[PDB]
């Protein structure tokens, strides 16, 4: 269960949205961790893990550049 | 790449406070990831990255069990 990187998120996201964005994918519900900066504000980045390595590879390829609200998100890893 | 987990932080913590905890080490900026469960609630846990294995090992051993707020933080990694 590799973890993948998720960038360029709107800063209006929620945890439900991120998980929904991965609907149909073998994602781990309590694996999301949101990155913030020194000023206490989100950076639009987060880490998300899945049940397998082929499921993380499948997400990155399949959902890269796709949108969460308005922002087209960028995926990488593992 | 060399990330570590942090646990036992009060549920309400700021990044500015966390960075204070890791002063003197090369914590990759913006890498501080706050974790959430499948309910989308604060876990008191985070992930943090360093540039080398050496600095993530150096942080885990020195700072392990020090406070952030009123709790003795627990480090695990790389």
PDB file of C-alpha atoms in Angstrom:
ATOM      1  CA  UNK A   1       0.000   0.000   0.000  1.00  0.00           C
ATOM      2  CA  UNK A   2       2.050   2.721  -1.417  1.00  0.00           C
ATOM      3  CA  UNK A   3       1.342   6.335  -0.592  1.00  0.00           C
ATOM      4  CA  UNK A   4       1.000   8.817  -3.432  1.00  0.00           C
ATOM      5  CA  UNK A   5       1.347  12.589  -3.677  1.00  0.00           C
ATOM      6  CA  UNK A   6      -1.503  14.906  -4.510  1.00  0.00           C
ATOM      7  CA  UNK A   7      -0.827  18.517  -5.463  1.00  0.00           C
ATOM      8  CA  UNK A   8      -2.545  21.710  -6.567  1.00  0.00           C
ATOM      9  CA  UNK A   9      -5.682  21.211  -4.472  1.00  0.00           C
ATOM     10  CA  UNK A  10      -8.246  23.978  -3.913  1.00  0.00           C
ATOM     11  CA  UNK A  11      -7.917  25.141  -0.320  1.00  0.00           C
ATOM     12  CA  UNK A  12     -11.640  24.621   0.071  1.00  0.00           C
ATOM     13  CA  UNK A  13     -11.219  20.815   0.263  1.00  0.00           C
ATOM     14  CA  UNK A  14     -12.386  18.487   2.875  1.00  0.00           C
ATOM     15  CA  UNK A  15     -11.418  14.992   3.697  1.00  0.00           C
ATOM     16  CA  UNK A  16     -14.680  13.631   2.244  1.00  0.00           C
ATOM     17  CA  UNK A  17     -13.894  15.352  -1.081  1.00  0.00           C
ATOM     18  CA  UNK A  18     -10.394  13.847  -1.367  1.00  0.00           C
ATOM     19  CA  UNK A  19     -11.735  10.349  -0.690  1.00  0.00           C
ATOM     20  CA  UNK A  20     -14.642  10.883  -3.093  1.00  0.00           C
ATOM     21  CA  UNK A  21     -12.123  12.040  -5.709  1.00  0.00           C
ATOM     22  CA  UNK A  22     -10.729   8.530  -5.396  1.00  0.00           C
ATOM     23  CA  UNK A  23     -14.114   6.784  -5.528  1.00  0.00           C
ATOM     24  CA  UNK A  24     -13.929   3.350  -7.142  1.00  0.00           C
ATOM     25  CA  UNK A  25     -10.337   3.078  -5.973  1.00  0.00           C
ATOM     26  CA  UNK A  26      -8.924   0.930  -3.196  1.00  0.00           C
ATOM     27  CA  UNK A  27      -7.972   3.898  -1.031  1.00  0.00           C
ATOM     28  CA  UNK A  28      -7.404   3.747   2.718  1.00  0.00           C
ATOM     29  CA  UNK A  29      -9.991   6.076   4.439  1.00  0.00           C
ATOM     30  CA  UNK A  30      -7.794   7.109   7.363  1.00  0.00           C
ATOM     31  CA  UNK A  31      -4.537   7.525   5.446  1.00  0.00           C
ATOM     32  CA  UNK A  32      -4.952  11.166   4.351  1.00  0.00           C
ATOM     33  CA  UNK A  33      -2.616  13.660   5.807  1.00  0.00           C
ATOM     34  CA  UNK A  34      -2.835  17.392   4.744  1.00  0.00           C
ATOM     35  CA  UNK A  35       0.301  19.514   4.376  1.00  0.00           C
ATOM     36  CA  UNK A  36       0.383  23.079   5.707  1.00  0.00           C
ATOM     37  CA  UNK A  37       3.012  25.797   5.774  1.00  0.00           C
ATOM     38  CA  UNK A  38       4.696  27.747   8.569  1.00  0.00           C
ATOM     39  CA  UNK A  39       1.858  30.275   8.403  1.00  0.00           C
ATOM     40  CA  UNK A  40      -0.770  27.708   9.317  1.00  0.00           C
ATOM     41  CA  UNK A  41      -2.403  27.644   5.879  1.00  0.00           C
ATOM     42  CA  UNK A  42      -2.794  24.567   3.618  1.00  0.00           C
ATOM     43  CA  UNK A  43      -0.361  24.177   0.738  1.00  0.00           C
ATOM     44  CA  UNK A  44      -2.811  22.287  -1.428  1.00  0.00           C
ATOM     45  CA  UNK A  45      -0.754  19.135  -1.007  1.00  0.00           C
ATOM     46  CA  UNK A  46      -1.498  15.899   0.831  1.00  0.00           C
ATOM     47  CA  UNK A  47      -0.404  12.258   1.089  1.00  0.00           C
ATOM     48  CA  UNK A  48      -2.858   9.423   0.332  1.00  0.00           C
ATOM     49  CA  UNK A  49      -2.254   5.648   0.695  1.00  0.00           C
ATOM     50  CA  UNK A  50      -4.030   2.627  -0.876  1.00  0.00           C
ATOM     51  CA  UNK A  51      -4.445  -1.101  -0.188  1.00  0.00           C
ATOM     52  CA  UNK A  52      -1.862  -2.089  -2.811  1.00  0.00           C
ATOM     53  CA  UNK A  53       0.908  -0.680  -4.980  1.00  0.00           C
ATOM     54  CA  UNK A  54      -1.026  -1.372  -8.174  1.00  0.00           C
ATOM     55  CA  UNK A  55      -3.913   0.653  -6.814  1.00  0.00           C
ATOM     56  CA  UNK A  56      -1.682   3.634  -6.105  1.00  0.00           C
ATOM     57  CA  UNK A  57      -0.085   3.304  -9.538  1.00  0.00           C
ATOM     58  CA  UNK A  58      -3.551   3.090 -11.079  1.00  0.00           C
ATOM     59  CA  UNK A  59      -4.759   6.272  -9.377  1.00  0.00           C
ATOM     60  CA  UNK A  60      -1.823   8.487 -10.368  1.00  0.00           C
ATOM     61  CA  UNK A  61      -2.077   7.442 -14.022  1.00  0.00           C
ATOM     62  CA  UNK A  62      -5.859   7.508 -14.129  1.00  0.00           C
ATOM     63  CA  UNK A  63      -6.658  10.618 -12.064  1.00  0.00           C
ATOM     64  CA  UNK A  64      -3.712  12.904 -12.713  1.00  0.00           C
ATOM     65  CA  UNK A  65      -4.772  16.390 -13.917  1.00  0.00           C
ATOM     66  CA  UNK A  66      -8.359  15.696 -12.887  1.00  0.00           C
ATOM     67  CA  UNK A  67     -10.302  18.259 -10.817  1.00  0.00           C
ATOM     68  CA  UNK A  68     -11.411  18.602  -7.225  1.00  0.00           C
ATOM     69  CA  UNK A  69     -13.920  21.417  -7.488  1.00  0.00           C
ATOM     70  CA  UNK A  70     -12.113  23.852  -9.797  1.00  0.00           C
ATOM     71  CA  UNK A  71      -8.480  22.872  -9.431  1.00  0.00           C
ATOM     72  CA  UNK A  72      -6.949  20.313 -11.718  1.00  0.00           C
ATOM     73  CA  UNK A  73      -4.944  18.216  -9.356  1.00  0.00           C
ATOM     74  CA  UNK A  74      -1.502  16.684  -9.993  1.00  0.00           C
ATOM     75  CA  UNK A  75      -0.640  13.191  -8.818  1.00  0.00           C
ATOM     76  CA  UNK A  76       2.715  11.457  -8.437  1.00  0.00           C
ATOM     77  CA  UNK A  77       4.406   8.558  -6.686  1.00  0.00           C
ATOM     78  CA  UNK A  78       4.910   6.063  -5.281  1.00  0.00           C
TER      79      UNK A  78
ATOM     80  CA  UNK B   1      11.532  10.910   0.704  1.00  0.00           C
ATOM     81  CA  UNK B   2      12.672  10.225   4.301  1.00  0.00           C
ATOM     82  CA  UNK B   3       9.439  10.761   6.207  1.00  0.00           C
ATOM     83  CA  UNK B   4       8.651  10.000   9.846  1.00  0.00           C
ATOM     84  CA  UNK B   5       5.472   9.814  11.910  1.00  0.00           C
ATOM     85  CA  UNK B   6       4.705  11.999  14.924  1.00  0.00           C
ATOM     86  CA  UNK B   7       2.154  11.056  17.569  1.00  0.00           C
ATOM     87  CA  UNK B   8       0.776  12.287  20.882  1.00  0.00           C
ATOM     88  CA  UNK B   9       0.541  15.972  19.948  1.00  0.00           C
ATOM     89  CA  UNK B  10      -2.417  17.831  21.447  1.00  0.00           C
ATOM     90  CA  UNK B  11      -5.308  17.654  18.978  1.00  0.00           C
ATOM     91  CA  UNK B  12      -4.994  21.379  18.453  1.00  0.00           C
ATOM     92  CA  UNK B  13      -1.476  22.257  17.342  1.00  0.00           C
ATOM     93  CA  UNK B  14      -0.093  24.816  14.882  1.00  0.00           C
ATOM     94  CA  UNK B  15       2.651  24.235  12.299  1.00  0.00           C
ATOM     95  CA  UNK B  16       4.467  27.200  13.689  1.00  0.00           C
ATOM     96  CA  UNK B  17       4.534  25.200  16.979  1.00  0.00           C
ATOM     97  CA  UNK B  18       5.669  21.947  15.327  1.00  0.00           C
ATOM     98  CA  UNK B  19       8.522  23.656  13.481  1.00  0.00           C
ATOM     99  CA  UNK B  20       9.654  25.014  16.871  1.00  0.00           C
ATOM    100  CA  UNK B  21       9.883  21.396  18.033  1.00  0.00           C
ATOM    101  CA  UNK B  22      12.113  20.476  15.088  1.00  0.00           C
ATOM    102  CA  UNK B  23      14.340  23.525  15.270  1.00  0.00           C
ATOM    103  CA  UNK B  24      17.950  22.730  14.378  1.00  0.00           C
ATOM    104  CA  UNK B  25      17.145  20.008  11.879  1.00  0.00           C
ATOM    105  CA  UNK B  26      16.588  20.200   8.139  1.00  0.00           C
ATOM    106  CA  UNK B  27      12.874  19.559   8.038  1.00  0.00           C
ATOM    107  CA  UNK B  28      11.773  19.924   4.394  1.00  0.00           C
ATOM    108  CA  UNK B  29       9.463  23.012   4.357  1.00  0.00           C
ATOM    109  CA  UNK B  30       5.769  22.395   3.698  1.00  0.00           C
ATOM    110  CA  UNK B  31       6.280  18.682   4.326  1.00  0.00           C
ATOM    111  CA  UNK B  32       4.403  18.839   7.617  1.00  0.00           C
ATOM    112  CA  UNK B  33       1.367  16.739   7.030  1.00  0.00           C
ATOM    113  CA  UNK B  34      -1.452  16.646   9.595  1.00  0.00           C
ATOM    114  CA  UNK B  35      -3.263  13.279   9.616  1.00  0.00           C
ATOM    115  CA  UNK B  36      -7.016  12.606   9.657  1.00  0.00           C
ATOM    116  CA  UNK B  37      -9.093   9.470  10.203  1.00  0.00           C
ATOM    117  CA  UNK B  38     -11.876   8.259   7.897  1.00  0.00           C
ATOM    118  CA  UNK B  39     -14.224  10.551   9.781  1.00  0.00           C
ATOM    119  CA  UNK B  40     -12.129  13.526   8.727  1.00  0.00           C
ATOM    120  CA  UNK B  41     -11.174  14.459  12.270  1.00  0.00           C
ATOM    121  CA  UNK B  42      -7.796  15.522  13.766  1.00  0.00           C
ATOM    122  CA  UNK B  43      -5.745  12.523  15.008  1.00  0.00           C
ATOM    123  CA  UNK B  44      -2.945  14.266  16.918  1.00  0.00           C
ATOM    124  CA  UNK B  45      -0.574  12.768  14.347  1.00  0.00           C
ATOM    125  CA  UNK B  46       1.556  14.086  11.539  1.00  0.00           C
ATOM    126  CA  UNK B  47       4.264  13.150   9.041  1.00  0.00           C
ATOM    127  CA  UNK B  48       7.419  15.156   8.388  1.00  0.00           C
ATOM    128  CA  UNK B  49      10.210  14.804   5.852  1.00  0.00           C
ATOM    129  CA  UNK B  50      13.922  15.461   5.918  1.00  0.00           C
ATOM    130  CA  UNK B  51      16.413  15.576   3.050  1.00  0.00           C
ATOM    131  CA  UNK B  52      18.591  12.708   4.274  1.00  0.00           C
ATOM    132  CA  UNK B  53      18.046   9.457   6.190  1.00  0.00           C
ATOM    133  CA  UNK B  54      20.730  10.800   8.553  1.00  0.00           C
ATOM    134  CA  UNK B  55      18.658  13.833   9.657  1.00  0.00           C
ATOM    135  CA  UNK B  56      15.430  11.870  10.079  1.00  0.00           C
ATOM    136  CA  UNK B  57      17.334   9.404  12.247  1.00  0.00           C
ATOM    137  CA  UNK B  58      18.968  12.274  14.132  1.00  0.00           C
ATOM    138  CA  UNK B  59      15.610  13.903  14.853  1.00  0.00           C
ATOM    139  CA  UNK B  60      13.794  10.755  15.930  1.00  0.00           C
ATOM    140  CA  UNK B  61      16.427   9.867  18.558  1.00  0.00           C
ATOM    141  CA  UNK B  62      17.108  13.318  20.068  1.00  0.00           C
ATOM    142  CA  UNK B  63      13.607  14.823  20.064  1.00  0.00           C
ATOM    143  CA  UNK B  64      11.739  11.637  20.816  1.00  0.00           C
ATOM    144  CA  UNK B  65       9.564  12.063  23.928  1.00  0.00           C
ATOM    145  CA  UNK B  66       9.787  15.844  24.168  1.00  0.00           C
ATOM    146  CA  UNK B  67       6.800  18.085  24.604  1.00  0.00           C
ATOM    147  CA  UNK B  68       4.717  20.007  22.123  1.00  0.00           C
ATOM    148  CA  UNK B  69       2.119  21.629  24.285  1.00  0.00           C
ATOM    149  CA  UNK B  70       1.602  19.375  27.304  1.00  0.00           C
ATOM    150  CA  UNK B  71       2.332  16.004  25.688  1.00  0.00           C
ATOM    151  CA  UNK B  72       5.506  14.000  25.174  1.00  0.00           C
ATOM    152  CA  UNK B  73       5.743  13.492  21.425  1.00  0.00           C
ATOM    153  CA  UNK B  74       6.626  10.168  19.888  1.00  0.00           C
ATOM    154  CA  UNK B  75       8.797   9.840  16.823  1.00  0.00           C
ATOM    155  CA  UNK B  76       8.985   6.859  14.486  1.00  0.00           C
ATOM    156  CA  UNK B  77      11.061   6.586  11.346  1.00  0.00           C
ATOM    157  CA  UNK B  78      12.500   6.764   8.820  1.00  0.00           C
TER     158      UNK B  78
END
